């Protein structure tokens, strides 16, 4: 994606304040609670029947930390997200069979968690830049579907 240098510096400087473990656990947890149908891929995680069970599930935050870690590392390859996610894209398509629409859902859920955590620091201009990033990541994650 092309972020203006002042947009990139706004993304970068807020990412440095992120506790990936926590935020990733918050984002994937909320995804499974707000949009229940996404749970189809995660039935071996255990009990997801209640919001509290979802938020408390060890398998969930462990997976969340896994996912956000990947995301995090892509934020440094902003110049080429397609090559950065090429192999992961093939994996979600061919192995996992994950509908790309889920990448978009998560992306929006993530933007809500950041606002929740940075309150006043997550200004409309900063949100604008992150929206570009999550749309870029979701598009990169889906480029290898056939």
């Amino acid at each position: 994606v092309h972020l203006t240098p002042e947009e990139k510096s706004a993304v970068t400087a807020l990412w440095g304040k992120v506790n990936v473990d926590e935020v990733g656990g918050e984002a994937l947890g909320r995804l499974l609670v707000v949009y229940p149908w996404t749970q189809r891929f995660f039935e071996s995680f255990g009990d997801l029947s209640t919001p509290d069970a979802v938020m408390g599930n060890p398998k969930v935050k462990a997976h969340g930390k896994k996912v956000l870690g990947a995301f995090s590392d892509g934020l440094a390859h902003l110049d080429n997200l397609k090559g950065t996610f090429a192999t992961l894209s093939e994996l979600h398509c061919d192995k996992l069979h994950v509908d790309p629409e889920n990448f978009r859902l998560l992306g929006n859920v993530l933007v809500c968690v950041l606002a929740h955590h940075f309150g006043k620091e997550f200004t409309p201009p900063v949100q604008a830049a992150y929206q570009k990033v999550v749309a870029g990541v979701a598009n990169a994650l889906a480029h290898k579907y056939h």
Partner: protein, 141 residues
Amino acid sequence: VLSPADKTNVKAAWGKVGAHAGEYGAEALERMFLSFPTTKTYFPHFDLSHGSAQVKGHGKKVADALTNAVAHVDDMPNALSALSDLHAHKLRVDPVNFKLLSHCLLVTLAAHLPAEFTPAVHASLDKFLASVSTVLTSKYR
């Protein structure tokens, strides 16, 4: 909401499909798999080759279901009650996918019934398919 006019248009055009429903349902499915590759993620257990008997079998089920909704155009939420539970609790198909199938369903009818696919009927069928999608995704959350 489906006006009496919409109902008449839907009953008229589906009546014409007659016995070709299953065939049209299958075609719609093949059109969607090709035009929207992401939709294939929900049928990873299916043989998806041109003329796959699994696809032909599923096309029929989908077609049968639409025929049942037309036959009960006045009580659709109840006539499709079972399928809603199914898509919501077991299949969990992202709602955006119904839009893609609906569209392919419309292209299939357009291609097979040029005499009856008028702008008025086109409008009505699109509304019909949308109202069916809405019924099938009403219990998702």
